[model samples]
Target: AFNDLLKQVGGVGRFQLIQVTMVVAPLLLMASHNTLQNFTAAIPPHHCRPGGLEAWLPLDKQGQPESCLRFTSPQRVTEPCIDGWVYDNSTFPSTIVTEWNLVCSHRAFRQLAQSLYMVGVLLGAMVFGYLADRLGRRKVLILNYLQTAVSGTCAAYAPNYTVYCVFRLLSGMSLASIAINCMTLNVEWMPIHTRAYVGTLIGYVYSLGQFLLAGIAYAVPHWRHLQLVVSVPFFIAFIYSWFFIESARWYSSSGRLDLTLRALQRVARINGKQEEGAKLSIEVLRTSLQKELASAMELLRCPTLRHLFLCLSMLWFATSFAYYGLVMDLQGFGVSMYLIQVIFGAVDLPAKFVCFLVINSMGRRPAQMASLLLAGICILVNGIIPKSHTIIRTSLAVLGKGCLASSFNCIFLYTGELYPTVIRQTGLGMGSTMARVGSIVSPLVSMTAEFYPSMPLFIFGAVPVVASAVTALLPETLGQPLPDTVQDLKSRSR
Candidate 1:
């Protein structure tokens, strides 16, 4: 039904193309913000400022520059760095580590900043997710764009680490809100057949943003400049966002049938189907709108929605947990940061293409399960391998990340298709909230590696492998029509 009405209004027409393009464009910048810390907080080689006594600095067993220790004049006694450290700015001119002296004792703050950002993302998902449902996707999306622009720019100019962390947290909150609203708008406006392709295109744009970040980071070299570069674009995105139409599905769900009619008519005119659009009377549209308000708890009140939410939450958590674990440790490879970022970003191209194929041909459940299983298996093997085998280890890690990337693409589309339009944004928000939780917990789990070298890898590996089993329980959503209401979903299951 509603999809049938959407078709009458010229589905996948010019309006939708423009809508998706505008919406997904910001995601590129959002991607940059998500991983911006990789460059902005990069740890460079440093040692205590010698205070005109360079000879006093002692080399470690490997004969490399000692980062945290120095020697005193009397009997060459070893001591912690007394003076502030001097950083080698060859690779990075200015990073948070170099500027804030976030090394040695202050090293923990680096991960803590990212964890705070993840906390912001989690909270935003909870708050804005519900808000989008109550207010509408377009309103929340525009606000998010403005929020990201301002917060991100402020982060670039932050005078202290604490200020920077706060701005980053604000930026993170906008990231989740923008993504949820944009994706919901896209799903609601477009035809079902176009959903997977459009979703994959959004993924590609994110990959492109990584490549953009690598280039920008290489060119800018300073954390502040790079941060500023990514932030300013959202302001532009914010300006154009005012032109977007709210989700008519949302209006119908709220029983605002008049607004739904006008929106569809506007879309119909844009898509050159005004005649058909005019024919979409209130009675035809009234049948689609249940006129019943649904709360977040309604997600659990229904059996199928509960199952979908729990399963999708696990998939989201596992994918992000493992994905961030691999990407965050780029320095572990001993390769050029730009080169590795490109490699990591490039791998998504093929992974998502193959995932798109599998999604269309083999069905979504298998693609989802297979991606998690393969990613988990790859990480477990990498964990088992010897550290000296850099070639195999790096290769496995990249492959695992690619699989996780594919899993991400699968989950977004799967989650959108799984939930009815009534609570779609809320469902995605809750699911991605778990993802933020996983991301926050990821580095904490990495701390366990101090006890056992490969403990983090094993945990990351085990999570997705178990979650892959959970994927089996989800119904296949391939080629299925989008559900308009909870009763619609219940009827389908029956």
Candidate 2:
């Protein structure tokens, strides 16, 4: 049993803690890039230009630079801004928006860049999901992280937006691997009882990274510098893997018993359980691996897990779409981007704490449903609030964002536990694929606000209502044995 294996390795001791800590840094670094686009591509204040050549943007009655109308008389007319837009360097020293003048008419391109990165995330999830299952979690991701770092550097130096988009897309690819591998590795390596705990705990690490991103962005105040800071940190993950242990469950189940044994033995030694390590035999692990050779076909063909997959996949999509929608829109609230970003990161800690308490005891399903419900309700509340009610609206919106963060924490852990180990990566990846789909559209949700003020909020708020409802139908994984293979799921269900 998975429990037997985890206990043998010292049961959430120094070994597991150390491993999670190491992975935490990578998660943070990955997070930095995940949101790098939000800050790096921020469209600074600008307005319409009537003439073909350079034209100064006129301010509005409030002495603020206008973003939609011309500064001159007859301001009702729209301008092409062909000469190029000037930026307010005071707020953002340098950004993709200022560098290439992507504001006003070209503003959609800002979110489009995020959408492109998410496209890469979608592709990378599919690719890495396969590779993690085939090549082993640690092995495939080492290269992925290195390339993520390189691509991040390349993007920072990109002279043109085209090249910058290409590199950003590539960086998104590696970032996907980071998300997939980290979630899979941490859960696979821990004991079943500890699984729910680790799942939400990981979010705290990501939130920390998010805070760091805001700080780095605030301190550096340059897009290129922000990219370098976020990109280079991923290499630390590779270095950690080089010196440390990896998920033996992945190795053992992937048919590399020899390496698995080595990793487990190292885990034992580092965990001060050499006596137990020596007592364990390769033959036992080999049998376990053989039993775990479940087929992906069975995962879908089985009625129970297939339904589980379908529902969870949609849940993944909903949470990501809603979260990113709220996350990206955190700016433009008449507050400093840095402070708001930090506040956004900080407020989520409470949600993590909530999940940490009830997830296992109350059941993953209920917690999942509750968090989504909270988020969905908040979204509805915020959308209905009058524009004059900025105070109430911002409060509700942030509360909703916090709930979305909770939902995210719940889904990752829940999905990891729901699928059998043999096809866990693929299962989680499928959910992530759904998440990527949501993320791809998430940027567009923000863009759609051009037509309606609360349109994005309405959509963001409504999705979780459906997702939360669907979760009630999914099985509760709390305090239950994890399925080792698709056959196990079927047999257990029967």
Candidate 3:
């Protein structure tokens, strides 16, 4: 195994540990962006108010004004909000809800905000995914820090919905690069035995970041300021990233023996194997590069590899749409938005821990299949439950969320193991794009809940059930040496 050779330098050493922190921390911030919509665009308790005429109009249950109904001449009349909407600032101080008055008939645009961002992610996945494989991970990885900081800051100042949506999409694109490059880079650098937790652990941090956002949103009630808080930290990442060594796997596989030797020497020095560092040189790296490297495009070009690609692509869609659908669906579930957002981020940490154990005990395929099917069952059950069962509904939704988290973590680990060094970045990138396709429309999926409460839930549930069937088709990579080439992928445990 190339990783065993990485073992010669050392695996799970100080260098690898620090690299994991640097690589994984930004993913948490990306989580902040991923979930930001839950706060930023939240519509506070609001109603239509004609200036100075609020006393004349009857109060709806919300207590400020009525959004849809007006009583005149002893008859119920359908009246559009002719006056500006008034928002309750007690909870949010000022979100896009109060800032732009995205109320009354304009509520759907809130989902549009998330969708546009996912659209950006959908575009960036294929572009940056290939670039990481071709140009190297460190290069694209650095882009994430700067691009996120800049785009997010610009979004903080967006004058109108159009500009905000534009910046959101651009931010979405940059975050995709950060996520794809970092995940690929970490997989290339870490040990295969430890690879299972790598996804879950980083995801735990990502979930933690979301919980942190709940606090930031509470403290900074102003959406622009909240944006600033999340955007500024990445600059530190951008500057610190100059010291990030390129992935040794990338260098060796990309045929850059000079850079590969230096990276290995750097790793050896950091791991206290200076003698191994001394023994390594360009000649040794050259031979390793030839033996280990193959065209990443072959993951798509070859038949068996294509089969792996297709099944995972379907699973990618399942993992993303179902997860985001459930997340976005949290909006109207009869709970306080703030409390539910906090819960969404907080519950997933335990899910990651359970996922870590499940894969170790049960193996990847079983975990993936079981978690996804169970998650789907949870969501499907939610649709049938009566309207008054809020507690049971919320409880089941929370449980369903944990299952989705475990399922998502499994996909990351399974793919990292299944794709070899030769084509890992490209395969992951392509998989990410397929996932984004699900996210891009997830908001719309939630909107279907308006027509029929369970329609969206049913959609979210059915996809994963279909995806688990898809997972059964993928070759289990558990306990196998990580593949390093298309040939290795074709021959693995078949």
The most accurate candidate by TM-score is 1
Q: Which is the winner by lDDT between candidate 2 and candidate 3? A: 3
lDDT of each: 0.86, 0.79, 0.80
Q: Per-residue CA lDDT of candidate 1, range 350-443, in tens?
A: 8988888999999999999999999999999988998777778888888998999989989988998888898997887678778889998887
What total of clashing residue pairs does each candidate reach?
A: 0, 1, 0
The candidate with the higher lDDT, 1 or 2, is 1
Query: Candidates' TM-scores?
Result: 0.85, 0.83, 0.84
For model 2, the superposed segments whose C-alpha errors exceed 4 Å read 1-17, 48-78, 191-193, 254-257, 272-308, 355-369, 386-390, 412-428, 469-494
**Highest lDDT scorer:** 1
Please identify model 3 stretches exceeding 4 Å from their true place.
Answer: 1-11, 51-55, 58-65, 69-78, 191-194, 268-275, 293-311, 349-366, 386-388, 412-430, 449-454, 468-494
Task: TM-score winner between 1 and 3, please give it.
Answer: 1
Tens digits of per-residue lDDT for model 2 on 308-390? 78998889999999888877875646566777788788888787787768786798999999999899999888778776665
Sorted on lDDT, highest at the top, how do the candidates line up? Answer: 1, 3, 2
